[PDB]
């Protein structure tokens, strides 16, 4: 039986969004590529290189026109006519716009493609922008996080495959099952917040009792995500706050990579 085709293009990526797949369990990356999808282009795992892999991509864009899911990680740099990311001698923005023309669905995996992320922060040396900014006529599904839990992506793809449409999205085109709620509106340390039980420094008596990390700079009050519920790596109990460190807001534009670790969040 034929598997739904996927084209994955990395722009100004660190590869952490691909690496998230190697932690996934449902499906595992081996089951993803052998059973769930046909990964038609992915430069991290491709046997073919250079001329051969660019042939593969051109053939796949033609063969699967109107059928493939396009996935992009990393920001897209517009400064100086796109030369801050060049693949096969051409600006990655041009590779992305060409692949976008025939896509059935387009996913920005990670904060960099979803809203510019760390690559667009500070002075933004390369004029990095989001995938939605380079594809104004297209509905881009945003799966933010640095990187997201890989199942935020895989269950989005599965919804498209199994039920024939995207999952329900919020007003930033983020799937509601993963991004529908503030972390602070579903955080197991909320009782400590409510009682004024706060860690003041790592290793202090409150910190060693699992108290709230608000006064260490926790951005849960201003970050949408599922980090406190789905958490990470499917082992149970693993997310930054449960390990002892505040949320940094890496999901959320204007929070992660903008605010200091210890800068206090606004509470709604």
């Amino acid at each position: 039986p034929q598997r739904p085709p996927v084209i994955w293009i990395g722009a100004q990526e660190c590869t952490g969004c691909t690496e998230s797949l190697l932690r996934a369990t449902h499906p595992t990356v081996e089951n993803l590529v052998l059973e769930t999808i046909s990964l038609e282009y992915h430069e991290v795992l491709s046997a073919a290189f250079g001329h051969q892999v660019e042939e593969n991509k051109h053939n796949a864009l033609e063969k699967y026109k109107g059928q493939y899911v396009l996935v992009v990680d990393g920001s897209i740099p517009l400064k100086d006519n796109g030369i801050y990311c060049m693949v096969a001698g051409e600006p990655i923005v041009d590779h992305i716009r060409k692949a976008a023309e025939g896509a059935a669905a387009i996913i920005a995996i990670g904060s960099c493609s979803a809203w510019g992320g760390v690559a667009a922060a500070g002075v933004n040396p390369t004029g990095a922008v989001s995938l939605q900014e380079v594809l104004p006529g297209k509905t881009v599904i945003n799966i933010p996080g640095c990187p997201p839990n890989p199942h935020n992506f895989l269950a989005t793809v599965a919804h498209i495959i199994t039920y024939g449409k995207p999952p329900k999205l919020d007003d930033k085109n983020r799937p509601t099952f993963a991004y529908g709620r503030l972390i602070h509106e579903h955080c197991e340390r909320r009782p400590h917040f409510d009682a004024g039980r706060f860690a003041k420094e790592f290793g202090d008596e409150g910190h060693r009792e699992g108290w709230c990390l608000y006064h260490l700079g926790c951005k849960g009050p201003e970050t949408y995500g599922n980090c406190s519920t789905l958490q990470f790596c499917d082992v149970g109990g693993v997310w930054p706050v449960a390990i002892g460190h505040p949320c940094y807001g890496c999901n959320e534009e204007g929070i992660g990579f903008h605010k200091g670790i210890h800068q206090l969040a606004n509470v709604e």
Partner: protein, 551 residues
Amino acid sequence: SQRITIDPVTRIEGHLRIDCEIENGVVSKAWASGTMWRGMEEIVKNRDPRDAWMIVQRICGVCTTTHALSSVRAAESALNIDVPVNAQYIRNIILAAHTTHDHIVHFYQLSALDWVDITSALQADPTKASEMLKGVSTWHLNSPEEFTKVQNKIKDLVASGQLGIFANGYWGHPAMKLPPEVNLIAVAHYLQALECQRDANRVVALLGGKTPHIQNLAVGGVANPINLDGLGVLNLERLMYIKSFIDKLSDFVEQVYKVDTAVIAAFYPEWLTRGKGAVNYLSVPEFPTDSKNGSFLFPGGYIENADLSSYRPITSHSDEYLIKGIQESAKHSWYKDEAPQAPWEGTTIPAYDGWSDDGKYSWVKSPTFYGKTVEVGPLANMLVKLAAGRESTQNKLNEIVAIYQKLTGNTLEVAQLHSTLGRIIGRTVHCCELQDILQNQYSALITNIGKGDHTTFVKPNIPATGEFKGVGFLEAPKGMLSHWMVIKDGIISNYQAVVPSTWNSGPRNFNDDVGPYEQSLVGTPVADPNKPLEVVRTIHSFDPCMACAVH
């Protein structure tokens, strides 16, 4: 004679272009080019020293953890902070488990398809394949039944007509030398490797808070709250869970990865005589175990002109000989300031002008050590350990050589390690020795907590005036990493990362001397210039990471 381009190079991290002049069927000259830049050094400038690590960790998601740990060490260096020993044990477990994942994925997911022909695996006899491993490995998943199940998955993929990422590969190339049976064994081990690396990252996750991109560090130690009697913190139950994953890694590493490394050498012995990148090698000591950022479990040093007998040991991350030697040039890179720069005085001013064979052709800077080109990474690391007389390293290399000896009747000399296969062997030896690091540091942590030490963090102070310079060294999966922070009036006034793939991938330097990638390719035979598999074999042996090389 002709000029070829390999763009993109796949089965690496990031964006790499390789150009080669081919004369008389052999590479005569090569260019390595990093084709993507972010300016992560500029992004982190003018921030609080304490915030840098969360930003610069995003230099790379393959070598996640490494930039985070180098960044906190750099701030700790500037501030003169001695890290609590519990924080060292936790940092060390994370780096060792991460590196285990990183090397396994490199050998199987990134490199194996240079050496392995999956089409040829369809012609294999699974029973014959299993019989070949009798007395060679004790691994419990080399049965004919395992191999038949794997062969059927390949059959089903080919039958679907959707080969995807396995499509248009180098199947039947004349440089593919494995018998069908060995191709099938390799594919089975490729799939088994994915289970092992998943377990390595469960160790990382339970201390880091997630992976990729850990979130448990701090300038001053770690965010893990140690309390054996505490609900919701790092208690004995959580530590037992960590140990349950540490224990799952050894068998695959010793019985599959170590053995496959010896077997690839046995079938490709010509690759012990090509891909030499340099005559100088650098590594830093790693896994500090005392209360003052020292007493490393792994040694470091500098080898000049391949002379192990006269190498210089490096025992400290504060070694002024190491610190003062390091410079970077942008003469053949797309930056404005071209003279060699010490990283505390480094600039990163973009000056893209397009590709020129004799001008600027890369976003990678050109690092030197006292004016010389140096290879870093597992080959450097292994050669320094052999120079130090480290028995653990001698013994592990000897185990790979004994498997090679048994299969070929030939031995391996140190001279043969200066090669594409030597590089791969150093990586495998490193992965094997890291499993003892994990057992040692888990035990050290349990013992130290039992003595009543739950300390994990010392809150720093940052003077609001003055200028302070710090450097954080780390022996990353790809080699010696350093982050260089200048603090002025309480904020980061300069930040420079010198990354292992910068050393190896960097273009021609201020003296037009050739870096390791470009040097390693001279003399490479290329049977088919349209399908230069031989070039990609040598380049993959360095485990390129271009997000790392360029940042």
